[PDB]
Design a protein around this ligand. Structure first.
Ligand code: UDP
Ligand code: UDP
Ligand code: MN
Ligand code: MN
Lengths: 492, 495
């Protein structure tokens, strides 16, 4: 067994290098030439808040077993992940690093790293995916605490202690670092924002939200305190090993990638635990836009199956909002979920409604009877209040997909509302400007209907259509319904 | 004295009507022909939330003295204001209606209304303005509670009781209705949004803000509860008369119009009271875009003087952010403020910092050492994160004056930050996209400086300037500094 600095990087990485004139992105969907130029222990900036840097860390903490699964990872990235763990962590807190080789083309990618101090490799005999691979690693772990990392990460200074501190104090906390960005094109290590929480839209796709201004102000007195998060990214976290086992590990029927982060996040929160982001812990990750590896049956379908298994188990009736956003998903078969359902019963988990009220209250929930919702689009332009209030005109600006003044709904009452203001036909003469006024269910002047395959908006009981021809010279108007481009509007 | 329905509207309004062929907007800056067509007690829609419509209050409420000041008001609007008070209020709660005629051209506009039940008229011998006029009315008032209304309002159903209920329960509350819109062109009465609070930007100009999503959720269990507001619009409110006197009435040196709403709002909050909007109370107001009346020295100057008197007394150091937004104001003389300053001392009022933390925390406040702040504007476009986070490109969208992704600062450390992300020069080759990255004081790639009279942004120690030419085809870039329009950028506040 070899100490990490004595490992021959050139011998390991050389041989698998990008051949003169070939595509440097095809193998990994990140730039392998830039990854391969880097030293295995390359220096990275210290992206931690200044208060983290002066803190002296407890080291009388339980040791962890680090589990890293991989399938056809670039050698340089995989080695660098392993050495960042070894170099940046107090040695007595790294029990072992378990590499789960998930049926990589070349078994040597993993096996050669087995010579490094503390590294143990487990090879899957066939492709199993990240969920089953992680469980295999977790089942082999000897330590009290599990750390999961992707195979293209770089740990920053004193990344580990702040995470272990949390779980040592309360075993029901599942904790994450701030995930810095390793640029997929140039491999620069870039400090992320510390002001984010994880979350998702009803399509169940992970996204980062900024904290609210009031959340940020409430932290001004300790800006590096833990941040409770509705959802973790899912690749990088630390969890008490027995807690992981007792909560049901992962759903063993999820395949290759996607959705397991949903499932564990809902499960942890609903069943009595918590999820945190720990600002003093910084780890870089190579974010990419595309997957480099195979999906048995296409990635659209596998993601949908995994996501459905999460939704059917955890979301109660709120699953229907997922299906409302992704109707294609109702047709993807998902398999037996009985063991998961009984796991939920066994654990006395709270309902999804509780999750929404107590964990993720800032997730906007549709009125069950809303007809349409979101932005109202015409070309690249979007219906916009222009910051106006009651008795104000309405207009368009370029769609920014950020809500605010471009948030609308078509209601059960047939009104096109923003907040409690409704598009109002003040005057039926063609060319008359429409106005924002307080919504009233009885006001016929506020009734609208979609027509011509949800491509236009007609004022109910008239032949007037919403029209943008005067938008930059007074505001939106009502015009006689006709073939013009200025009367095309679609909710999205 | 005559009951309001026996008052001859046609005789009062007729004679001052818009003369055959003349401009119907010149006299009032609203459409006088449309105002004059209306009955004095015309029906208006009930714009109250449904819960208001079935609601009881206490019922032993203190009566109010209604004060309405006016200068050259349209007779039809003035009459209609008075009759809406008389018709829509329980008679035992209207002690009197005091009309303060602030030196109108024709003294008969007011005097003729003196024949109406409960109406008392006080004429100023010279022009005094709304602040001094209100105080005169308040000083004449006999009731426990004051109600101030403009001379072109229309009270809606059960407008008064919900307001009096609040001040009867706690005399330190100064309370307002939701102010519905009476359209200045057609005089239609339009229901306003109930989801607003008053506020202001650093230019100290009143504006309406939507409540936050978390404020709205916390009200889901009683959607017509009082709404605490950092600032009132200022025309329409109710206040315990003794509380009004004890807090210092209004600043008697403010002239004609503007700024008194700032001053009373800061004073009430800082000195122990509160400000509320009461959704069950609805009153329409003729909003207009221009003033119909004279300002001794121009309206820009009078507004600035009044505003400065508010700022110098109440805002402590935060006045400098007002001056940073309106540098022209540092040159407007404001007069002696000593009585106001001692009033502040006498009352043990809290500092403006307290106001910002506890009353108006959603007003974005620059760091004391920030160089510049706000939006970064180029024409009608604004620097925008595009919802991106670290390692993301940056761009522009049309300025929406709503903060969010168009909020920036130029810091003590020379960085252009949004949240804890900073514009970062990743690559110095001209045309290279800039990126958002976590702010670090040591990173020379994040240093920027204003040049050419605060009209551009140059990357420090280079001849590269922030540039928008690739904004819709990749993002903002760094380009060699030159005379192009795509390199013009101005912060809305410069210290
Ligand atoms: O079939 C698979 C697919 C992915 N992975 C690994 O699981 C982790 C997460 O995958 P990826 O980084 O592709 O996901 P992302 O972080 O991009 O969402 C990485 O270490 C992959 O090499 C794996 O072991 N088997
Ligand atoms: O010098 C003045 C200016 C205004 N007013 C009256 O004060 C009220 C407030 O003025 P205005 O409605 O112009 O303010 P706005 O609501 O337009 O801000 C009105 O009843 C005016 O006629 C007055 O008595 N003296
Ligand atoms: Mn990854
Ligand atoms: Mn007014």
């Amino acid at each position: 067994k070899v100490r990490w600095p004595d490992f021959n990087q050139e011998a390991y990485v050389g041989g698998t290098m990008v051949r003169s004139g070939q595509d440097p992105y095809a193998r990994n969907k990140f730039n392998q030439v830039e990854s391969d130029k880097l030293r295995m222990d390359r220096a990275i900036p210290d992206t931690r808040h200044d208060q983290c840097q002066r803190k002296q860390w407890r080291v009388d903490l339980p040791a962890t077993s680090v589990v890293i699964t991989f399938h056809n990872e670039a050698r340089s990235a995989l080695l660098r992940t392993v050495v960042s763990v070894l170099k940046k962590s107090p040695p007595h807190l790294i029990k072992e690093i378990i590499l789960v080789d998930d049926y990589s083309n070349d078994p040597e990618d993993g096996a050669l790293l087995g010579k490094i101090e503390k590294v143990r490799v487990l090879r899957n005999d066939r492709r199993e995916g990240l969920m089953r691979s992680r469980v295999r690693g977790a089942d082999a772990a000897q330590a009290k605490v599990l750390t999961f990392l992707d195979s293209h990460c770089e740990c920053n200074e004193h990344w580990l202690e702040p995470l272990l501190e949390r779980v040592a104090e309360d075993r029901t906390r599942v904790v994450s670092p701030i995930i810095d960005v390793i640029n997929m094109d140039n491999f620069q290590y870039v400090g992320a924002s510390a002001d984010l929480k994880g979350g998702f839209d009803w399509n169940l796709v992970f996204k980062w939200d900024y904290m609210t201004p009031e959340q940020r102000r409430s932290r001004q007195g300790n800006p590096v305190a833990p941040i409770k998060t509705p959802m973790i990214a899912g690749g990088l976290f630390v969890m008490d090993k027995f807690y992981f086992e007792e909560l049901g590990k992962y759903d063993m029927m999820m395949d290759v990638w996607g959705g397991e982060n949903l499932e564990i996040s809902f499960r942890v929160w609903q069943c009595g635990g918590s999820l945190e982001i720990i600002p003093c812990s910084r780890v870089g990750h190579v974010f990419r836009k595309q997957h480099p590896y195979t999906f048995p049956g296409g990635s659209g379908t596998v993601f949908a199956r995994n996501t459905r298994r999460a939704a059917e188990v955890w979301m109660d009736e709120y699953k229907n909002f997922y299906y409302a956003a992704v109707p294609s998903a109702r047709n993807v078969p998902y398999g037996n979920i009985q063991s998961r359902l009984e796991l939920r019963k066994k654990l006395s988990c709270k309902p999804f409604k509780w999750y929404l009220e107590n964990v993720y209250p800032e997730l906007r929930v549709p009125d069950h009877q809303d007809i349409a919702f979101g932005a109202l689009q015409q070309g690249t332009n979007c219906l916009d209040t222009l910051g106006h209030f009651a008795d104000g005109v309405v207009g368009v600006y370029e769609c920014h997909n950020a809500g605010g003044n471009q948030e609308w709904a078509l209601t059960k009452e047939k009104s096109v509302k923003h907040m409690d203001l409704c598009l109002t036909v003040v005057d039926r003469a063609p060319g008359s400007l429409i106005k924002l006024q307080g919504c009233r269910e009885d006001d016929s002047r506020q009734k609208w209907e979609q027509i011509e395959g949800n491509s236009k908006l007609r004022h109910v009981g008239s032949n007037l259509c919403l029209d943008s021809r005067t938008a930059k010279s007074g505001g939106l108007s009502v015009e006689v319904c006709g073939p013009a481009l200025s009367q095309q509007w679609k909710f999205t």
